[PDB]
């Protein structure tokens, strides 16, 4: 099926899992920062950036979730290849 | 803005660092996707490739947005610091 060694598959899996975790943490931190900025900057100057952040955030979340699913699949596949 | 220039710049740094980290993850994982896809015959990985490709441009746009916010914040901090 897959022509890659278990050892390399597991290294890839760590990259996907670590990427997922880091993207979730960045989105959490910057979501907090957006809130603090938006609340302390009255009026409209930052509004275009807020609108784009809100539109893109759910996609970034979706991407982190995908990465976690790829991690799980690669773990499974490494097991099967090795066994 | 009701925030000190120093705090505005601390936040700016976080947006920049986040952007850099996301672009690094995206570059690394795009290379992984290609290698895994190339070495997996049949349809098993196809759905993950499809979903990755659908979302990656939006993640790239998000990284770009964070750099734009970083520079907007820097410029705003400069203006606050100049306002007597
Ligand atoms: C190199 As940077 C942390 O200013 O985007
Ligand atoms: Zn390799
Ligand atoms: Zn994790
Ligand atoms: Zn604060
Ligand atoms: Zn006012
Ligand atoms: Zn940067």
UniProtKB/Swiss-Prot annotation, chain A:
Keywords annotated in UniProt: Coiled coil, Secreted, Virulence
Gene Ontology CC annotation, any one: extracellular region
Top-rank taxon, per record: Bacteria
InterPro entries: ESAT-6-like_sf, T7SS_ESAT-6-like
Coiled coil: 59-83
Pfam assignment, any one: WXG100
Protein location: Secreted
Chief location category: secreted
Family: Belongs to the WXG100 family. sagExaA-like subfamily.
Known role: Virulence factor that is important for the establishment of infection in the host. EsxA is required for EsxB synthesis as well as secretion. Modulates host cell apoptotic pathways and mediates together with EsxB the release of S.aureus from the host cell. By acting on apoptosis, plays a role in the modulation of dendritic cell-mediated immunity.
Protein name: Type VII secretion system extracellular protein A
Source organism of the structure: Staphylococcus aureus (strain Mu50 / ATCC 700699)
């Amino acid at each position: 099926m897959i022509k890659m060694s278990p050892e390399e598959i597991r290294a890839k899996s760590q990259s996907y899992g670590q990427g997922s975790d880091q993207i979730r943490q960045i989105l959490s931190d910057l979501t907090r920062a957006q809130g603090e900025i938006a609340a302390n900057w009255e009026g409209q100057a930052f509004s275009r950036f807020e609108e784009q952040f809100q539109q893109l955030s759910p996609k970034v979340e979706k991407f982190a979730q995908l990465l976690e699913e790829i991690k799980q699949q690669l773990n499974s596949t490494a097991d099967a290849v090795q066994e």
